[PDB]
């Protein structure tokens, strides 16, 4: 069987920089028309000039013939000038801005201390129509890791949305039934992205019969009941949830070690993985919208013009993707997948 | 400068492995503990007396001269174990207790028990003979969330088993929950528990926040802070049916820092000092000796040790790496400075 | 090593009658606590009195100490009175009723002409909670033998189940990926039995490098892909598939001849054969459920109280089993098997 | 009764066996057929000229006086066969053709060809000399389903071989599929095929429905009815590159009715009348003579027979059994009434 869809987009991806970038860009560019490129580089993307330079590094690494456009984001920080974000948006450089968890001790050039501290930039985004992408977790030491997303909803997301009622918000990589229900019952200004790992697995898959660092990502995999809620949300054809891989590559040496980094390198296997989930939920009819229509509609962008075909032909995901000095282990490395791109 | 002198402790739950690993890890246990309950989950489980005698000899071969240490062997319960094999090992002074591993609950447990009914005849003989039952109390069904496995075992397996065999001595090994803490606290004199240093010292956030830490990954898995606090309060209260059991379970670095890391903390090198730290933090040093050196022997009907061990509140760093023949071993709290250390 | 399981049951067996019954019963009674005894004698079991008499001839032949209970079935025929099955069921004589393939030219006292013809009895079964055991094949002359099972699913099973939605149905001796999927994707009122031959072999084993009538049975062995679907179904731990040997003995003279009868005499070697299949599939943890728990659960009967132990002692299956005038050739006759009962 | 007179036919594919079996079966072929292609798969395959001459003499010894019959011998192809042995036999009038049996494809085929590359020099010499290649077209890999073996052979072996040797005469023996029927129908003048009576009269249901019938078991195996219909349609069209080849392959009853029955139908006694029946059913009796007596000779470049055989639509029963020295032989359609019979 063949599954033909309009060329999809990836509404949440990390392309890194330098040699990493050169290696990972092709996995996104071959398949996706556009991708929302997250801004969390060593020196975060907090200026139009840096965004332009990063965009060109990305373009330099796209293989010949890939019809790919990187959509850049601004990393919100306490010290960010609202005029810088405005300038970048007005010039087509910034498509959106990303809010990472607040911490009172974060350096002002590297993050936000509180939503209060950046209300002027948020208000400017509301004025201009700039989408706010949110990593919705509280990161206070006394909050259990598994409760961080639910806590954010109540302490940060709801009060923020109640104030900036015309602000477009994407609740990124949702992982709980709490978020699924909040987004489901929300208004037209609220959307969400969902990763392939949060649909395919739960915390047992990461911790039962051994510990699996390649399944370790943030927000952390939750209880089976949460996974079930996310699968049911996409299976329903809900129009405000769309594809965001959160492909977040780290070298093998940084994953398989005493303190492993959070992040699943899923760009090489994500699309076929989502196809598998939709098939298992008897929801293939809703697959195209999730991958290729819902995100564009929410962002006010046109759907892609070309097509991508997936075939139910069993292929094996490589165990390793070579980098210059180390390697990347892809999501589902070594496994035989049911759907592959034609 | 502060010195804490206690009667020589015992480790009521340890894994010594075999071969080169055994030679490397045995000394960390034998130097400090008078006796240790040696778990039977080897590649080929210890299910016969001859296997247990051979293994014990490999253990003795690796004990340095001068170490007052006696390994207490255990029998790995299986569905088809003949009650007579355990009984003669018990009479021959080979088996001190029998260990119940639910199949696939942890390391080398594919041969574990699949139902209590299947081993009921063995359990009944154990009850007659006064042989203690050591239990890894976790259900293993795929639909049960990992953090719920111990609590579920209490309701579905432990309680019914105890209602059947009312005179069987049971040790709820390495308790990790408030559920088990309360169950044991409110249980009768035939019920005891062991508690590891990691379940007192950490909770799941310490294994998952700011990075994933395979060296803190063990089974039963570290739980929510509320459980950790219940365990700390239990030991701080001087509860007499909870005692030292490290569950030291070493795996080489290559089996830990990999795509599918094995469960187990190699805590033998730092456990006693870690327990000391917890008791101090709970203002319960008055109950420390009992936990380490009296509660276990009393429950097992064994004499208390006659030698001594001194701990000093002098900073010492746990090694970053322990060499093996073709890999390395990472100790629990590797490279970290610890508050209390055992004086040589 | 040793595999200890709760005493199993055989949910589909043919014990024949007379001298053959005296010979074959011990192979079932020694190992199984209970068995569903098929009703296809020369004069089929279609009355309570005939089922009571046959049950006693079976009990007469059980060696001392076996503790075996035959569970009797009623052969469904166009002429059967619903009240006769009801009586037999209330009196504990009939445990279930068996539906053999329909044929418009079958004698009314020997079979069914169509499911329509027996709806009143099927409706009575549904009302009372009597399980329907189905030999699911269409036997029309223009249907290829390898297609008979699939054809039955679409033309008879699905419409029957859509109407009698509260009727418990056991799809007997399934042999196709079609049936495996149908049952797997079914509701709690649908179960299946699987023979050792359908797990161990495929049609090549019966027809390549010689023709092997001792592997000839109905439904016929299918292509390797079907055998693989059956092995994957039991290896998954699927709770609605259970042990049914379909042991169907015929004398050597009736098997090795110009027109050989269908049926494998597998009672003597079935349990060890299943153990080997589960071992090959790295699925021994599910072996007990298949043999001793799933069937009792579906039928609403208690699990057996005793145990059976299988050991890796490689023993040989006899070349034959003596009868009065001829002999029986067991399944895997003369072969060395990996697992045997202790 | 309708009388059908045809030019004396030939059987382009027969197994005469050896010893007592040969003495019993040769007469069934020699009485009716002017010539027969005698297959080389004896216990010790016919791979040398001297072996062929000796065998041919044993065949002649068994031919009744008055039977106008000439056995045409074949060389069993093997990986190591020297082209010179086949060439000399061809020139000496011993070998009419060479038969390719894929290793383990059928009866006495363990010494068969394992790769077309291994015998390429022989095939190239056959091409230059005009020696036809007779092929048992089935792959033998264990993973390939028996019903797909013929179709797979066309794609993986036959087509590449024919593309390599464009002037080699090839007979696709006993075709059983629509795949092969269409391949031959659409092929060039260097390709032909033989068709047995069983593949025209029956499909796999006839062998497996309501009982298992080893006497209908042959290789290539009977296929689905759609294949049978493609074969009947092919011959009914009067297609000129398909001709009579019974593949009469006798086995004693003890070798057929047993736990592992041999492949082969003993159809020589009833074949011609059986073909007559099929052609009649297809309203194709006008093409019957060509199928039986002209198409093969034309492809092989041999003259048509000069004698005659008459078939009458008088029903006769095929015997239930044929006596042998220490067993019995069951003929194709044993004990059945047949519509057409050859007139003595
Ligand atoms: Cl919870
Ligand atoms: Cl097919
Ligand atoms: Zn994030
Ligand atoms: Zn991200
Ligand atoms: Zn344990
Ligand atoms: Zn342990
Ligand atoms: Zn049947
Ligand atoms: Zn049956
Ligand atoms: Zn052939
Ligand atoms: Zn032949």
Curated annotation (Swiss-Prot), chains B, D:
<dbReference type="InterPro" id="IPR006680">
    <property type="entry name" value="Amidohydro-rel"/>
</dbReference>
<protein>
    <recommendedName>
        <fullName>Dihydroorotase</fullName>
        <ecNumber>3.5.2.3</ecNumber>
    </recommendedName>
</protein>
<dbReference type="GO" id="GO:0005829">
    <property type="term" value="C:cytosol"/>
</dbReference>
<dbReference type="InterPro" id="IPR002195">
    <property type="entry name" value="Dihydroorotase_CS"/>
</dbReference>
<dbReference type="GO" id="GO:0008270">
    <property type="term" value="F:zinc ion binding"/>
</dbReference>
<feature type="binding site" description="via carbamate group">
    <location>
        <position position="99"/>
    </location>
    <ligand>
        <name>Zn(2+) 1</name>
    </ligand>
</feature>
<comment type="subunit">
    <text>Homodimer.</text>
</comment>
<feature type="binding site">
    <location>
        <position position="136"/>
    </location>
    <ligand>
        <name>Zn(2+) 2</name>
    </ligand>
</feature>
<comment type="function">
    <text>Catalyzes the reversible cyclization of carbamoyl aspartate to dihydroorotate.</text>
</comment>
<feature type="binding site">
    <location>
        <position position="251"/>
    </location>
    <ligand>
        <name>substrate</name>
    </ligand>
</feature>
<dbReference type="GO" id="GO:0004151">
    <property type="term" value="F:dihydroorotase activity"/>
</dbReference>
<keyword id="KW-0479">Metal-binding</keyword>
<feature type="binding site">
    <location>
        <position position="136"/>
    </location>
    <ligand>
        <name>substrate</name>
    </ligand>
</feature>
<comment type="pathway">
    <text>Pyrimidine metabolism; UMP biosynthesis via de novo pathway; (S)-dihydroorotate from bicarbonate: step 3/3.</text>
</comment>
<feature type="binding site">
    <location>
        <position position="41"/>
    </location>
    <ligand>
        <name>substrate</name>
    </ligand>
</feature>
<dbReference type="Pfam" id="PF01979">
    <property type="entry name" value="Amidohydro_1"/>
</dbReference>
<dbReference type="GO" id="GO:0005737">
    <property type="term" value="C:cytoplasm"/>
</dbReference>
<feature type="binding site" description="via carbamate group">
    <location>
        <position position="99"/>
    </location>
    <ligand>
        <name>Zn(2+) 2</name>
    </ligand>
</feature>
<comment type="similarity">
    <text>Belongs to the metallo-dependent hydrolases superfamily. DHOase family. Class II DHOase subfamily.</text>
</comment>
<feature type="binding site">
    <location>
        <position position="174"/>
    </location>
    <ligand>
        <name>Zn(2+) 2</name>
    </ligand>
</feature>
<dbReference type="GO" id="GO:0006207">
    <property type="term" value="P:'de novo' pyrimidine nucleobase biosynthetic process"/>
</dbReference>
<feature type="binding site">
    <location>
        <position position="219"/>
    </location>
    <ligand>
        <name>substrate</name>
    </ligand>
</feature>
<feature type="binding site">
    <location>
        <begin position="15"/>
        <end position="17"/>
    </location>
    <ligand>
        <name>substrate</name>
    </ligand>
</feature>
<feature type="binding site">
    <location>
        <position position="13"/>
    </location>
    <ligand>
        <name>Zn(2+) 1</name>
    </ligand>
</feature>
<keyword id="KW-0862">Zinc</keyword>
<feature type="binding site">
    <location>
        <position position="247"/>
    </location>
    <ligand>
        <name>Zn(2+) 1</name>
    </ligand>
</feature>
<keyword id="KW-0378">Hydrolase</keyword>
<dbReference type="InterPro" id="IPR032466">
    <property type="entry name" value="Metal_Hydrolase"/>
</dbReference>
<dbReference type="GO" id="GO:0044205">
    <property type="term" value="P:'de novo' UMP biosynthetic process"/>
</dbReference>
<dbReference type="GO" id="GO:0006221">
    <property type="term" value="P:pyrimidine nucleotide biosynthetic process"/>
</dbReference>
<feature type="active site">
    <location>
        <position position="247"/>
    </location>
</feature>
<dbReference type="InterPro" id="IPR004721">
    <property type="entry name" value="DHOdimr"/>
</dbReference>
<feature type="binding site">
    <location>
        <position position="15"/>
    </location>
    <ligand>
        <name>Zn(2+) 1</name>
    </ligand>
</feature>
<keyword id="KW-0665">Pyrimidine biosynthesis</keyword>
<feature type="modified residue" description="N6-carboxylysine">
    <location>
        <position position="99"/>
    </location>
</feature>
<feature type="binding site">
    <location>
        <position position="263"/>
    </location>
    <ligand>
        <name>substrate</name>
    </ligand>
</feature>
